């Protein structure tokens, strides 16, 4: 029958932004000093809008704020080196949005002279300058995804032995039915796909994850499939809060055993940038005969041209 | 010699969005039912990005959150009617950004079914439906400004007798000299004008304010001139934090007594919408012989065409 | 067989501080200015309160609202609280837990002392009725004075269950003392495992373990209150009103009674984190325990006098 | 004429609780395991504490300890006891006295709740540690409190070492308004400078109390160095005297050299940590210049209540 492995190969013509995992890989191989300078240059070169509000994150930022410049620079080398320190382990314990807010606060303090700057006239190594040109050449959604993915990977491995208790964020209540937008997708009336996108746009992660088969999977961009409603809901709650999915176009094809493959293309806006960064996205669904989601992949596309790439099975 | 009044008339061909103060006046005329309905349609029709995290505003938001729907509505009517109640007096005490964050939280709660909705089947009064239509046609910058000035004037007069102690926000440290961007303006090299714009983009209001005469004046769009370095400093700290001024063009003209008048056009972005709303702005400066600002007007322009009307 | 009403009459001679409800009743029939003047005399003639609840966001914001008001508007809010007027502030106050209401008034008293909140007017004279109340309070013992002040400020603002009430605020549930670090009480005259289990659980804030000692339809009757029936309601009361209580029982009698039930009376003192070892309240616990050792009924009484700690009359 | 040096010897009979610095010193010679065991055994006979480290830096570092596995929590406490150079120890050093005490209070409450690692089961005090515990068990209440306070305040790093972190500041409490102040009454004494000092301190009016000192006047707290000059005295009062209640009972006034007066007062001090539970037995020894300004005041924790009656004139 159908497996997660076979579902991953649906719509083979979908062109993803492989510049993202390429640059994240190159980035990760630089020394601490290059990584930090790249983060500063990448950040500065780029319209962000903001949480590290929570008491643990706020207090560790206050610890950094009271340190002399030399001790602040050491904390940042430790995060970029993935060193074993309590600050690195606490950073590992942070949810994605707290990691992002943590870095955003350090960037603001650097610009205010509160946190040690990159050393004036600092010289990017050859490999680092290459990485920065790679980032400059990428589109807006690719640039944000490289920055996000790079800072997320800093500090210690969060599942290594002796890991600290993972921080919990409040579940934001969903938009009430009466106030939800309903998407229209040119060429698609599939109730499961419309249900998924409408529930996600409402932050209704309970209703979105209920559409999944108990052993179904969600594959985020450039990640492994996340299997089962418990782990999918956890991913949605941590990584999909306030995403706005603006689907444009789709194709639906019956496949073997009464399953249906549906491809949708459109834009996703993140609360981090609002209407200033539309990420070019594809959703690839495999839907079972009962209308349960067996698989969905979210792909960051190479360019806006890929929004028009809806090729039927040959 | 110049006065604030005579300074106000510099660059007379400048076309300001009088739709904004118009629609704002219609809005103020409406009953509370129609005012709340319009706010809600505006907040739904329009990509906002954010505050009222401060203890007073947070606790008052929690008070509204625990009320039944009927008492929540009554509070919101009291704000629209500018009634004399502790909640209205506290709201009047808030800074501009706390008032905006307060209303933003109520709109998020209404969308989540935590705060009473506008009744399905509530129908706008005729006038209200006109006011709403007038807003839909106006451009983004003008819509944001209507929405801003409407909610800022809710609750009580902040300077009335019996007013509550005004709340204060933390003064944000300016951008450090090394990390500041310097603007270029086609057709302009005035050091005072460039110094004002660069200091404001760094949130360095002490440096911007030092560019004015003792009794120098700043006139925000559709407002009374603010007179004196202390009142200007107070206004910049409350209303200009995180504004990004993106001038494109300007003209300079010598006038009487060795004064200079300079008009600059371009865009301003606000942190509330970031790069998603560039408001269309002119700055009109009257500069004294020693290079001190006597007067500067900030004007919200009729349309993107006024960006070219320097003449 | 036993009912809540029959259980209420166990150990008939237990003499209770009836001056508390008397004085609480009289306090509330005074006008607002007298009520405020009397509270101010208490906070001053009793400045050994060790603390605060009201740190929580709602209570902190409403305090900041009162802080920014002019003296005339602050006095008006306190009159509204004393008059139990229908206002958002009085409805919010009504929604507070006991400890938040007490911390709220505590902050207002400190702010009055600091010149931040409008004081009782210079040389205010208590009406004759108010001087009678102050006199009764003065004649009452420490444990009784603490209860009158507590029960008086709790009853201010609006009826918390009136139509149009605001959602009740919730306090974080404090984790219990772990078993290895608990004190066990020893009570002279008593080895009843249920009674000891109850007192040790409460002194550890283990309200889940205390409530599990009750029958489904078991009741807890706090001083001068209606019985609270069932494990949900009793747990909600313990969480709100028993946090950090120290029960120092001294002596008890146990008696077998009809149907294989045992009745147990215990006397002792209770300390509250508001006053610590300062104020020991003279308390009797009256327990009716079923044949399985589950609690059917327990009354907590504030006793009329310290004599009552020896009144353990059997029959 | 008078020096801080000669002032220190006024009222030579006055017997102080020398057991306090004895035990503090003994305690600090023990290894980290004995130190933590003793803190727990001492704090366990002291649940009549009635209370802070509310402030964002302290709360976040407490949340950091709370999320740590037991092994890591114990290592942080060994670092504090060993005065190791770690960011946590440097932050701890930066704290005010009351934040240091609130920090240790939170860890004690967490230990009692099973949230922080206990003293290992069966743990056995070294011979020297059992000698320290015995001395603590024998000390009166005021002396036990003082030993615990001074012990925990001296943990973490040297707050004035090279590489120190920015000192945290606490909010200054508004004083009691004059209409609501108490006036003390002292048997034997109507000295307006002594009464003015005590009444001002009881109102938290540190500015008025400091204005009673000579420019180069000194305040000598129990078992500490003399604090010299109005700015230093004001900083000390703001940090360590908030909410103290002085209850002087008896005193003697003697005219001495150079137009000076010396005044000895005995009575009690209550602390907001303990309230009316613990009244510590205190003497105040004032040297007052001819203009009525304090040249020197020592506050002594007395050896026994018998010292309350040691008021002899010569």
Owner of token pair 């002032």: D7
Q: How far is B303 from chain A (nearest CA, A)?
A: 22
**Residues on chain D bordering chain C, Cβ-to-Cβ distance under 8 angstroms:** 44, 48, 50-51, 54, 111-115, 118, 173-177, 179-180, 272, 274-277
Reduced to 3 states, what is the DSSP secondary structure of residue D89?
helix
The residue among C244, C276, C279 with the most chain D CBs within 10 A of its CB, best to mutate, is C276
Task: Name the helix (H) or strand (E) containing C126.
Answer: none
How far apart are the C-alpha atoms of B285 and B221, rounded to whole Å? 14
Q: Which residue of D has its CA nearest to C277?
A: D277
How far apart are the C-alpha atoms of D107 and D156, rounded to whole Å? 15
How far apart are the C-alpha atoms of D123 and A162, rounded to whole Å? 24
C89 and C120, same domain (yes or no): yes
Task: Indicate whether D230 belongs to any domain.
Answer: yes
- Touching subunits of C (3+ CB pairs, under 8 Å) are B, D
Contacts of A2 (CB under 8 A, 6+ apart): A256, A257, A259, A286, A294
Beta bridge partners of C164: none
Output DSSP code: residue D49.
-
How many other CB atoms are found less than 10 A from the CB of residue C109? 18
D28 and D156, same domain (yes or no): yes
**Is the distance from CB of D273 to CB of D145 less than 8 angstroms?**
yes
How many other CB atoms are found less than 10 A from the CB of residue C311? 16
**Is the distance from CB of C158 to CB of C90 less than 8 angstroms?**
yes
How far apart are the C-alpha atoms of C157 and C80, rounded to whole Å? 7
Name the nearest CA neighbour of B193 among B280, B240, B260, B257.
Answer: B260
| Residue C23 burial by Cβ neighbours in a 10 Å radius (0-12, 13-18, 19+) | buried
Length of chain C: 315
Residue D206's domain comprises 184-314
A130 and A263, same domain (yes or no): no
Task: Indicate whether C11 belongs to any domain.
Answer: no
| Residue C199 burial by Cβ neighbours in a 10 Å radius (0-12, 13-18, 19+) | buried
Name the nearest CA neighbour of A151 among A60, A63, A36, A53.
Answer: A36
How far apart are the C-alpha atoms of D167 and D160, rounded to whole Å? 10
**Is the distance from CB of D142 to CB of D247 less than 8 angstroms?**
no
**Is the distance from CB of A272 to CB of A100 less than 8 angstroms?**
yes
Owner of token pair 């108990």: A214
Contacts of C166 in chain B (CB under 8 A): 63, 66-68, 71
How far apart are the C-alpha atoms of D193 and B185, rounded to whole Å? 68
In this structure, the strands spanning A293-300 and A212-219 are parallel
Reduced to 3 states, what is the DSSP secondary structure of residue B267?
strand
C35 and C158, same domain (yes or no): yes
Q: Which residue of B has its CA nearest to A271?
A: B49
Q: Phi first, then psi: give them for residue C298, nearest 5 degrees.
A: -140, 120
**Is the distance from CB of D43 to CB of D108 less than 8 angstroms?**
yes
CB within 8 Å: A179 and B110: yes
Name the nearest CA neighbour of A224 among A10, A28, A22, A5.
Answer: A5
Task: Indicate whether A178 belongs to any domain.
Answer: no
Output DSSP code: residue D156.
S
How far apart are the C-alpha atoms of C204 and C181, rounded to whole Å? 9
Contacts of B117 in chain A (CB under 8 A): 176, 178-179
Number of alpha helices (DSSP H) and beta strands (DSSP E) in chain B:
12, 6
Contact exists between D and A (3 or more beta carbon pairs < 8 Å)? yes
Reduced to 3 states, what is the DSSP secondary structure of residue A262?
strand
Beta bridge partners of D299: D284
How many other CB atoms are found less than 10 A from the CB of residue C260? 10
Name the nearest CA neighbour of D239 among D144, D311, D172.
Answer: D172
Give the one of D114, D272, D275 whose C-beta lies nearest to C178's C-beta: D114
Q: Give the count of alpha carbons within 13 A of B104, CB side only.
A: 20
In chain A, residues preceding a discontinuity (C to N beyond 2.5 A) are: 46, 50
Sheet bearing D213-220, strands edge to edge:
D227-228, D213-220, D294-301, D279-288, D261-270, D245-255
The residue among C60, C65, C79, C100 with the most chain B CBs within 10 A of its CB, best to mutate, is C65
A95 and A62, same domain (yes or no): yes
How far apart are the C-alpha atoms of B47 and B36, rounded to whole Å? 20
Contact exists between C and A (3 or more beta carbon pairs < 8 Å)? no
**Is the distance from CB of A272 to CB of A47 less than 8 angstroms?**
no
Contacts of A56 in chain D (CB under 8 A): 60, 63-64, 67
Contacts of D284 (CB under 8 A, 6+ apart): D194, D198, D246, D248, D251, D263, D264, D265, D266, D297, D298, D299, D300
First to last CA, chain D: 19
How many other CB atoms are found less than 10 A from the CB of residue C163? 6
Contacts of C77 in chain B (CB under 8 A): 86
CB within 8 Å: C73 and B165: no
How far apart are the C-alpha atoms of C167 and B292, rounded to whole Å? 57
Contacts of A144 (CB under 8 A, 6+ apart): A46, A270, A272, A273, A277, A279
How far apart are the C-alpha atoms of A159 and A168, rounded to whole Å? 16
Q: How far is A179 from chain B (nearest CA, A)?
A: 6
Q: How far is CA D76 from the centre of its chain?
A: 24
Name the nearest CA neighbour of A198 among A187, A185, A186.
Answer: A185
Q: Which two tokens stand for residue B58?
A: 């947070």
Task: Name the helix (H) or strand (E) containing D146.
Answer: helix D141-153
- Touching subunits of B (3+ CB pairs, under 8 Å) are A, C
How far apart are the C-alpha atoms of B267 and B262, rounded to whole Å? 17
**Is the distance from CB of B283 to CB of B263 less than 8 angstroms?**
yes
How far apart are the C-alpha atoms of B62 and B106, rounded to whole Å? 10
Beta strands in D84-161 (DSSP E): none
CB within 8 Å: B67 and C61: no
Beta bridge partners of B281: B266, B300
Give the one of C122, C177, C277 whose C-beta lies nearest to D277's C-beta: C277
Q: How far is A98 from chain D (nearest CA, A)?
A: 14
CB within 8 Å: B276 and A274: yes
Q: Which two tokens stand for residue B168?
A: 């204060």
User: What DSSP string describes A225-241?
Assistant: -EESHHHHHHHHHHH-T
Name the nearest CA neighbour of C33 among C96, C103, C81.
Answer: C81
Contacts of C89 in chain B (CB under 8 A): 86
Contact exists between B and D (3 or more beta carbon pairs < 8 Å)? no
| Residue C60 burial by Cβ neighbours in a 10 Å radius (0-12, 13-18, 19+) | buried
The shares of helix, strand and coil residues in chain D, as percent rounded to the nearest 5, are 45, 15, 35
How far apart are the C-alpha atoms of D297 and D287, rounded to whole Å? 6
How far apart are the C-alpha atoms of C41 and C59, rounded to whole Å? 24
In this structure, the strands spanning C214-221 and C228-229 are antiparallel
Q: How far is C48 from chain D (nearest CA, A)?
A: 6
How far apart are the C-alpha atoms of D251 and A193, rounded to whole Å? 87
A215 and A302, same domain (yes or no): yes
In this structure, the strands spanning C214-221 and C295-302 are parallel
Task: Indicate whether B2 belongs to any domain.
Answer: no
User: What DSSP string describes A48-72?
Assistant: ----TTSHHHHHHHHHHHHS-HHHH
Q: Which residue of D has its CA nearest to A66?
A: D166
CB within 8 Å: C61 and B66: no
Last residue of a domain, one of B101, B131, B161: B161
B92 and B189, same domain (yes or no): no
How far apart are the C-alpha atoms of A72 and B286, rounded to whole Å? 46
Contacts of A174 in chain B (CB under 8 A): 112
Reduced to 3 states, what is the DSSP secondary structure of residue D148?
helix
Reduced to 3 states, what is the DSSP secondary structure of residue A250?
strand
Reduced to 3 states, what is the DSSP secondary structure of residue B301?
strand
Beta strands in A29-185 (DSSP E): none
Reduced to 3 states, what is the DSSP secondary structure of residue D219?
strand
User: What CA–CA distances, in Å, run from B64 to A2, C158, C161, C175, D229?
Assistant: 52, 17, 18, 30, 52
**Residues on chain D bordering chain A, Cβ-to-Cβ distance under 8 angstroms:** 56-64, 66-69, 71-72, 76, 87-88, 90-91, 94, 163, 165-166, 168
In this structure, the strands spanning B293-300 and B279-287 are antiparallel
CB within 8 Å: D174 and C48: no
In this structure, the strands spanning B212-219 and B226-227 are antiparallel
Resolution in A: 1.9
How many other CB atoms are found less than 10 A from the CB of residue D34? 21
**Is the distance from CB of C116 to CB of C274 less than 8 angstroms?**
no
A121 and A192, same domain (yes or no): no
Q: How far is B289 from chain C (nearest CA, A)?
A: 45
The residue among C47, C48, C50 with the most chain D CBs within 10 A of its CB, best to mutate, is C50
**Is the distance from CB of D238 to CB of D174 less than 8 angstroms?**
no
Sheet bearing B279-287, strands edge to edge:
B226-227, B212-219, B293-300, B279-287, B260-269, B244-254
Task: Indicate whether B136 belongs to any domain.
Answer: yes
**Long-range Cβ pairs for the range A183-188 (8 Å, 24+):** A183/A245, A183/A246, A183/A247, A185/A247, A185/A248, A185/A249, A185/A250, A185/A264, A185/A266, A186/A248, A186/A249, A186/A250, A187/A249, A187/A250, A187/A251, A187/A252, A187/A310, A188/A250, A188/A251, A188/A252, A188/A262, A188/A264
A154 and A30, same domain (yes or no): yes
**Is the distance from CB of A231 to CB of A203 less than 8 angstroms?**
no
Alpha helices by DSSP H, chain B: 4-8, 19-29, 32-45, 55-66, 69-81, 86-93, 96-111, 126-137, 140-152, 191-201, 205-209, 229-239
How far apart are the C-alpha atoms of D54 and C136, rounded to whole Å? 40
Q: How far is B152 from chain C (nearest CA, A)?
A: 19
The dihedral over CA atoms of A29, A33, A36, A41, expressed in degrees to the nearest 10, equals -100
C117 and C241, same domain (yes or no): no
Chain A, chain D: beta-carbon pairs less than 8 Å apart: 75
Owner of token pair 């005065």: D83
Give the one of B58, B65, B162 whose C-beta lies nearest to C73's C-beta: B162
Name the nearest CA neighbour of B215 among B235, B231, B229, B225.
Answer: B229
Q: Phi first, then psi: give them for residue D95, nearest 5 degrees.
A: -65, 155
Beta bridge partners of D101: none
Last residue of a domain, one of C109, C132, C163: C163
**Is the distance from CB of B230 to CB of B236 less than 8 angstroms?**
no
| Residue D240 burial by Cβ neighbours in a 10 Å radius (0-12, 13-18, 19+) | middle
Contacts of D166 in chain A (CB under 8 A): 65-66
Output DSSP code: residue D306.
G
Contacts of C114 in chain D (CB under 8 A): 173-177
C230 and C311, same domain (yes or no): yes
User: What CA–CA distances, in Å, run from A171 to A86, A206, C85, D239?
Assistant: 27, 11, 37, 40
Q: Which two tokens stand for residue C28?
A: 């509330």
How far apart are the C-alpha atoms of C43 and C36, rounded to whole Å? 11
Compute the Cα dihedral for A68, A74, A76, A82 and give only its sign: negative
Contacts of B87 in chain C (CB under 8 A): 88
**Is the distance from CB of D95 to CB of D166 less than 8 angstroms?**
no
| Residue B1 burial by Cβ neighbours in a 10 Å radius (0-12, 13-18, 19+) | exposed
**Is the distance from CB of C90 to CB of C161 less than 8 angstroms?**
no
Owner of token pair 């399953």: A259
CB within 8 Å: C44 and D275: no
**Is the distance from CB of A309 to CB of A265 less than 8 angstroms?**
yes
How far apart are the C-alpha atoms of B48 and B273, rounded to whole Å? 5
CB within 8 Å: A275 and B114: no
| Residue C9 burial by Cβ neighbours in a 10 Å radius (0-12, 13-18, 19+) | exposed
**Is the distance from CB of B311 to CB of B293 less than 8 angstroms?**
no
**Is the distance from CB of C178 to CB of D114 less than 8 angstroms?**
yes
Q: Which residue of C has its CA nearest to B56?
A: C61
Helix axes of A55-66 and D56-67: crossing angle, nearest 10 degrees: 120
How many other CB atoms are found less than 10 A from the CB of residue C3? 9
How far apart are the C-alpha atoms of B50 and B59, rounded to whole Å? 19
How far apart are the C-alpha atoms of A154 and A157, rounded to whole Å? 8
The shares of helix, strand and coil residues in chain A, as percent rounded to the nearest 5, are 45, 15, 35
**Is the distance from CB of A152 to CB of A96 less than 8 angstroms?**
yes
Name the nearest CA neighbour of A280 among A309, A240, A241.
Answer: A309
How far apart are the C-alpha atoms of B60 and C58, rounded to whole Å? 7
Task: Indicate whether B175 belongs to any domain.
Answer: no
Length of chain D: 314
Give the one of A59, A71, A164 whose C-beta lies nearest to D163's C-beta: A71
Task: Indicate whether A44 belongs to any domain.
Answer: yes
CB within 8 Å: A58 and D60: yes
Q: How many domains does chain B have?
A: 2
**Is the distance from CB of C275 to CB of C262 less than 8 angstroms?**
no
CB within 8 Å: B63 and C88: yes
Task: Indicate whether C177 belongs to any domain.
Answer: no
Q: Which two tokens stand for residue A150?
A: 């790079």
Output DSSP code: residue C127.
-
B151 and B258, same domain (yes or no): no
How far apart are the C-alpha atoms of D15 and D219, rounded to whole Å? 18
Task: Name the helix (H) or strand (E) containing A138.
Answer: none
User: What CA–CA distances, in Å, run from D49 to B68, C276, D45, D137?
Assistant: 41, 8, 10, 17
Contacts of B65 in chain C (CB under 8 A): 167
Sheet bearing A293-300, strands edge to edge:
A226-227, A212-219, A293-300, A278-287, A260-269, A244-254
Owner of token pair 């057709």: B187
Q: Which two tokens stand for residue A301?
A: 């596309």
Last residue of a domain, one of B112, B129, B161: B161
Contacts of D113 in chain C (CB under 8 A): 175-178
CB within 8 Å: D275 and C273: no
Alpha helices by DSSP H, chain C: 4-7, 19-28, 32-44, 57-68, 71-83, 88-95, 98-113, 128-139, 142-154, 193-203, 207-211, 231-241
**Is the distance from CB of B134 to CB of B20 less than 8 angstroms?**
no
């Amino acid at each position: 029958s159908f497996t997660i492995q076979s579902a991953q190969s649906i719509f083979p013509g979908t062109l993803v932004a492989d510049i993202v995992p390429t640059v994240v890989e190159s980035f990760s191989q630089l020394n601490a000093e290059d990584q930090l300078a790249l983060l500063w240059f990448a950040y500065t070169e780029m319209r962000s809008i903001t949480a590290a509000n929570m008491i643990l994150a706020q207090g560790l930022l206050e610890q950094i704020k009271q340190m002399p410049f030399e001790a602040q620079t050491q904390v940042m080398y430790d995060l970029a080196n993935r060193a074993d320190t309590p600050l690195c382990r606490s950073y590992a314990s942070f949810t994605v949005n707290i990691k992002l807010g943590f870095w955003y606060q350090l960037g603001e303090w650097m610009a205010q002279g509160i946190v040690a700057p990159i050393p004036e006239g600092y010289k990017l190594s050859p490999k680092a300058a290459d990485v920065l040109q790679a980032i400059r050449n990428a589109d807006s959604g690719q640039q944000i995804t490289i920055l996000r993915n790079t800072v997320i990977s800093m500090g210690f491995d969060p599942n290594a032995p002796g890991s600290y208790k993972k921080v919990t964020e409040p579940v934001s209540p969903p938009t009430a039915p009466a106030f939800r937008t309903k998407v229209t997708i040119e060429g698609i009336n599939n109730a499961t796909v419309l249900g998924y996108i409408n529930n996600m746009n409402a932050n209704d992660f309970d209703a979105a994850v209920a559409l999944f088969r108990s052993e179904g999977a969600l594959q985020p961009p450039f990640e492994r499939p996340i299997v089962g409603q418990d782990a999918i809901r956890a991913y949605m709650r941590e990584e999909c809060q306030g995403l706005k999915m603006i689907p444009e176009r789709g194709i639906s094809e019956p496949v073997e055993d009464g399953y249906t493959q549906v491809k949708v293309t459109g834009k996703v806006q993140t609360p981090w940038f609002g209407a200033s960064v539309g990420m070019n996205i594809a959703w690839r669904f495999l839907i079972d005969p009962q209308g349960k989601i067996f698989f969905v992949a979210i792909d960051l596309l190479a360019s806006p041209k890929e929004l028009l790439n809806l090729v039927r099975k040959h």
